[PDB]
Design a protein around this ligand. Structure first.
Ligand SMILES: CCCC[C@H](N)C(=O)O
Ligand SMILES: CCCC[C@H](N)C(=O)O
Ligand SMILES: CCCC[C@H](N)C(=O)O
Ligand SMILES: CCCC[C@H](N)C(=O)O
Lengths: 396, 396, 396, 396
């Protein structure tokens, strides 16, 4: 039939893919090639014109990567997809395609660190100015908009405390003032949140996280209107960032996304159990998780997200020293800075990634001395809880 | 010993690589991972500081890709290397790292098309201005320099007629006026030309071509001073382009470069034979090849290049129609737009990639109606010559 | 801790694996090497002796493949594992290691076809005789045993009607008569059935099916006592079959098995729903599925298997023509002969794989003209049911 | 045209390969699949019949592996090829296909060790008897032939002293007595020796060595008549050994073989230089290399081999202790037991792989205490010579 007609799990498995036309091979072939050959001068001209369709050169497009792009377009309910070398490249290819010197961007403050660095330091050096606001307060977004504003940029949920942003409301504000809304949907995946359905114009992911899910691919994806995606591909990627995805990486991501539905269900089932355990623990001062009713934006979360996610942050009694002791005491959770893998990952920003940052400047960023971030994996939740309880008990 | 002490062929094989420390595995392991795990909070902090060394996350660095970066640094006689998602990303990561709004670039006109598009249309939109000149005339480079000039950018040999640029002379000019010299060394590879040895500051490659050599990887590399490379990595790649190379791609490129020396010898031995055949053919009006004495900059070529290269361009009698007939008549050479593969590739820009471009505007670009570009592969030269003679005879 | 102490899901994720010791890489590196290097003559001698441990050559052993072997040993509760080029190679490496001319094997008749071919035609040509019996009747196993019997071989569930074999009972019989019990556990995976826990001596899998689960690897595994596995490795694999697994294949299988638990849960949840639909359909004469109470060995299934599996066979009204029409009428299920993939696969042996086999000889094999075999995938069960209902309605 | 008409280098590059029919992808796609899908019941039946052609399941055949099989068939001037999991599997799949209990094999004594183990211990246990002879003496082959002899098996050149076997002469003897001649051509590759052209019936390789050439693939290949290969595939591989090659491994081998011609030229050019150096060294008692005129079968070598090969063995003054000191003193050559890689590999069997073997029993095998085996790589020969001279000087 048409792949956009089936159920979401069916789409996860089938969308964008079909048996190879030449051989019937079920798995999408890995077209690990740079070069494509033309049958005639005319065929080469047709493709190039670009009157006609077909492949030319992997930087421009590739059959393996095309399958991934089409699948994610289907999953996000967008027109077209564009794969990239990294989540960062997805974000910068998008914004550098849309903006030029003199343009303006309104961005959430609570965003991925490397994204913040790009917006804070790199963009202004190209004459593109950025205003940072608390996107949990839609009025601050409105107030920051200028005649030059081309884009409003948000993440939800957001690090490090998993605060939310009302996508539908922000979309309405952005659009009334003539701007596009770009949403980083990395944390949720299309299985749990669909920003385009809520009015966003463009969605970006680091597929490095849940979409691939297996901790072995760095990559990104952009989904949006065909007209925009074509510009992101034939100008942004081709000319500006050069951030194309390797066919092998696309193939692995296609392979990983096959289990997206069942992975997200288990990630979130596990996370809710662990979140409730942490909330009941007298040594834990705070637990940040959209699935707990005490979450400041709980009802918004229930309307906007189909599941509360696989990520939890929490504060351990005793601040920095307690946090360091705790992470040094886990036996199962692994100390690392990524998320959305099949293994449970844990990190303590104050002692690990922000040790040199001013204590008072971290607090401003929302990073307290006792804040721990946990990416819940596919292990038995009882084992993860036991490991956490063991480490917490020791640390406090 | 120290890898920088051995002969060039030995370096090609060994530099940057050694048996795996844990297992003794001879082949560089494919570290196809996103995540790296820390032993303690302290270890994570050390690496991040960045007081100490080790890995963190593949976008930042990876053991497989590091081996490739170190090898190419050795081969180009530079301090450090940085691998990228594509040749384009190597160029743009470099220039976007070096330049900001208000800055200026002097560039050769005879450059790779996509590079031209970036410099012509994208750079100016970021407030970075570019002046194009004929780099075969070093005085035009000097005359175009401004107080704001940060970079002089050149390719040699250059498309489509394989004209040359005097690297040593241009380096001297750039440096006297306080600018850096960036050279795209894709066409030659470090086996045939070493721009850093001639005064260039930074070298970029599309490894998609000869360095990989097997037509199955899109990738780039940047080589230069440690101080610059660190900025290209921790700002340019990390924040701006996001154009990181997949570990699998790095592994394939490491594998391909093992045979770089013997491949270049055969490519060039074959090309010289074919070039001489073409020069003797009464149906061929011109042959462009650095190995022919009639080449305008022949002596410069002999001083600057150890071999004349594997690329040949030539003009067939009868212009566009003849060129189209010829390429449609080959049986062995493959119609495609890449180069530096093991297979012989052929293309006729006027009928294939520039069919819609104004005939008189192509002529300005140096693209005549009868111009054919040939990437000579590893086949028996007698077979390639027979195929060419067959197609030429038919076309004329 | 010790990996054998955690919950089964935790083991699925972690067992046999750990971060790379040299770099901390979380993903098991792909040690795609043939050669391993020694530090000294002495080190080479030690490993070879084989006094000491370490690697030598990938045919003998490899770090990537070792991780897989250790994981599956843990999952099956066996001492050691040995990976192979295919499921067939797992079976033949095992049996050719155990048996020699003059030896005897008692085997189930209801086994994988290619296994049957090996036992029926190849074994006897090496002087190794085989008696086939109905293994659903343990007394037939006993009656067929001879002084020369070395091995009893069974599959459960078995094609094509998913009949069962009482592993514990057969193990007792085999052992009393001094024979080993070998069980092919491919259909269930260690998540659903553990033959070693029930008395079997050796377990074999085609990992091509559920263990890999992604339809992109041909491979096998053998699990058993260390003493046996060492012989299977250093004689059976090394000298006889040469059926070693590629490190890349082992890496993919490690990647696939990460989701084994959640995949099996969904496969079986989906299959039960589809099985019940089929049982309610007036156009379907029979449905063969361990999860239906009408199954001849239902109670045995409940004791021996934790889930009823993802495979269903059924007979459609109207025999051969109806079966052909049905499979030619599906739009979602894919016509193919493998199983345990994420996509739903369907096949009709009478018109597809046994068309030339004598109708009356197929009936003997249990293959009726209307028999359809279905491998239930991860799609929405409602979509699969709709596709089946559509095709059945058309066919009848 | 027809690939069998071009020059050998052209064949190396092109034979068995063409651009992908669906997309034009130049690189052979990696068809990393287990499953193949049929368009209809009829199509599945046709393929299975096996009336018609196409793919079914990777163990039986695969598009990537087919390309490799066709290429090597062309290079060896044989009808058909069959890829395998290892060199060992190529040999055993062949012999177990041809022989059954009561059959007999005449084999050279000077053969690969693991092959010897199979023939010495495993074959007889299947009722297949083997007589070992000195194949450098064709009369011993004749004298050992029995009415039951099905196969004569030889390697040339042979370990450890690189003695030769007269293929044409042995072929004539085998054929007159009604037997097949099987030749292991691993050491030479089709670029240097073509046993089928000299009368052999079947050729086997470990592609692990020169054919792949990059030290990252374990694999084998069999080349011979279509009638035989079909049996090796549909019985030997399918039923007996299960030793199929992974599509990824086939793709890597296809990639490696692209440079076979230029690699062999350099390997042999380097080896001849090193062999002459060793022959001139007063600390070296003997040098075994087909390229030295002092070689016992020099003239036979010149007729049978196009190049003398990349392998050298030699004896160092001072026996075992000297040999151990020497290999422990090299800085560039790597201590390892494989050959045909791009890196120079060295080994000293008496102290490394045969330390526990009886000194007098090694001598019988032709392994003297001072015997060193060297696999010459692609490094600068001057660097290898300097490393050897350094280590030899120290050791003596
Ligand atoms: C720059 C290190 C990567 C951080 C990581 N991407 C995370 O936030 O999960
Ligand atoms: C944009 C198509 C690629 C052109 C190709 N990189 C070449 O000039 O060889
Ligand atoms: C010989 C074709 C493969 C059959 C397939 N292994 C299945 O029974 O699922
Ligand atoms: C059993 C170790 C492998 C020996 C190796 N294949 C060689 O002779 O080169």
């Amino acid at each position: 039939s048409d792949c956009r007609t089936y159920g979401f799990n069916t789409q996860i498995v089938h969308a964008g893919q079909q048996p190879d036309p030449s051989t019937g091979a079920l798995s999408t072939p890995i077209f690990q090639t740079s070069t494509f050959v033309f049958d005639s001068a005319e065929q080469g001209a047709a493709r190039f014109a670009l009157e006609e369709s077909g492949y030319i050169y992997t930087r421009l497009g590739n059959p393996t990567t095309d399958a991934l792009e089409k699948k994610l377009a289907v999953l996000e309910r967008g027109e077209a997809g564009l794969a990239t070398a990294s989540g960062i490249s997805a974000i910068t290819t998008t914004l550098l395609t849309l903006c030029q010197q003199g343009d303006h961007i309104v961005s959430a403050s609570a965003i991925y660190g490397c994204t913040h660095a790009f917006l804070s330091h790199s963009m202004p050096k190209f004459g593109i100015n950025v205003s940072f606001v608390d996107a949990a307060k839609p009025e601050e977004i409105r107030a920051a908009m200028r005649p030059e504003t081309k884009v409003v940029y948000i993440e939800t949920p957001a690090n490090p405390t998993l605060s939310l942003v009302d996508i539908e409301t922000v979309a309405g504000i952005a659009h009334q003032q003539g701007a596009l809304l770009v949403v980083d949907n990395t944390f949720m995946s299309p299985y749990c949140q669909q920003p385009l359905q809520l009015g966003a114009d463009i969605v970006v992911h680091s597929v490095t996280k849940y979409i691939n899910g297996h901790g072995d691919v760095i990559g990104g994806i952009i989904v949006g209107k065909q007209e925009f995606i074509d510009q992101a591909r034939f100008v942004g990627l081709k000319d500006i960032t050069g951030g194309c995805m390797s066919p092998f990486n696309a193939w692995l991501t296609l392979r990983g996304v096959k289990t997206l539905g069942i992975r997200m269900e288990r990630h979130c089932e596990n996370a809710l159990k662990i979140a409730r355990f942490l909330e009941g623990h007298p040594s834990i001062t705070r637990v940040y998780y959209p699935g707990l009713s005490s979450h400041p934006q709980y009802e918004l979360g229930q309307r906007q997200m189909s599941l509360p996610g696989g990520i939890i942050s929490f504060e351990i009694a005793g601040g920095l020293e307690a946090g360091r002791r705790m992470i040094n005491s886990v036996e199962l959770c692994l100390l690392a800075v990524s998320l959305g893998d099949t293994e449970t990952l844990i990190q303590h920003p104050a002692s690990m990634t922000h040790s040199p940052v001013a204590p008072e400047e971290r607090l401003k960023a929302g990073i307290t001395d006792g804040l721990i971030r946990l990416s819940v994996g596919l292990e038995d939740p009882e084992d993860i809880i036991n490991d956490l309880e063991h480490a917490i008990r020791k640390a406090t």
